[PDB]
Symmetry: C3
């Protein structure tokens, strides 16, 4: 049972990808960056503001997929500077409650739109 | 728990301690493919677009060996040494995938196997 | 529906993540780095020592999840330097037997605690 997920409260998938794909109860989430889905530009603000937007964006995809952030089982967090990770960890506390998803945090070189953070993952409802 | 090793003679041999892909029930977990020519086991020569084409042909072969095709990929991870190349990736992908497209993530990283410019892995279902 | 994995033989998951999440026989493993679970500092030694510790850590999580490394179907390996990758093949050979998992090997910029290697993955029992 395969389905493309789209939410108009998450940035439009421009190009050869979908916001997420759902097969039975498992949902594969595309990477989200701090795009404001309205302006299609990065939200303005410090790292924390960008992290907030990434999770708001994922939340909308999760909701469009029939669940919420609580259904995320694995989260990949890509940062241009790992020094920012404690902020990610703390912001996550506002969007997730125990039990938390598995997680991998990696310091990488570049992200789309010069973002400071991109996160993707897997959800199971 | 029934673990099937996927192997295609039309994808680069999996050298070392990994398999080209593993199938369990409905899901196929695809290893990262770089722009290796399966016959020579050296990178193809050509511009970035040629590199990306080889990556998709390589993934295609693995998908075919797993009983499907690129259309069955539900998630694709694309790693690039330089994000300036991403438009070309999106253009090249367009020649291999049609709507409905897979979920995707694109990350600018530091190094790839064999100093490749692009590597992609993913997950297939069917 | 979801079960949280806790192994006291792998580094404690501090903050907003779980060591692993298990749902219907699929286990999503967090990234492990070469932390000694006792000291919560990196093990001392060269790259091979670090790689051993990463796999010991993953194995502990897999065991707490009701399986072992043999049940891993996909492994992501992140290295600060791909020059180290032959050692990864070598070390993995000691921890895994054919049939080997699918794998992606990526050279990245930085890792938690200045680690030289982090690996995460997916296990199916």
């Amino acid at each position: 049972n395969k389905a493309i997920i789209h939410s108009d409260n998450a940035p439009a998938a421009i190009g050869t990808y979908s916001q997420a794909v759902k097969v039975n109860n498992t949902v594969y989430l595309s990477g989200q960056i701090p795009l404001d889905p309205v302006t299609m530009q990065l939200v303005e603000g410090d790292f924390a503001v960008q992290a907030h937007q990434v999770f708001k964006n994922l939340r909308a995809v999760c909701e469009a997929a029939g669940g919420g952030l609580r259904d995320i089982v694995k989260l990949n967090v890509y940062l241009t500077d790992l020094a920012n990770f404690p902020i990610v960890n703390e912001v996550m506390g506002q969007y997730f409650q125990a039990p938390y998803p598995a997680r991998a945090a990696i310091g990488i070189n570049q992200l789309p739109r010069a973002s400071l953070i991109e996160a993707d993952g897997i959800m199971v409802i």
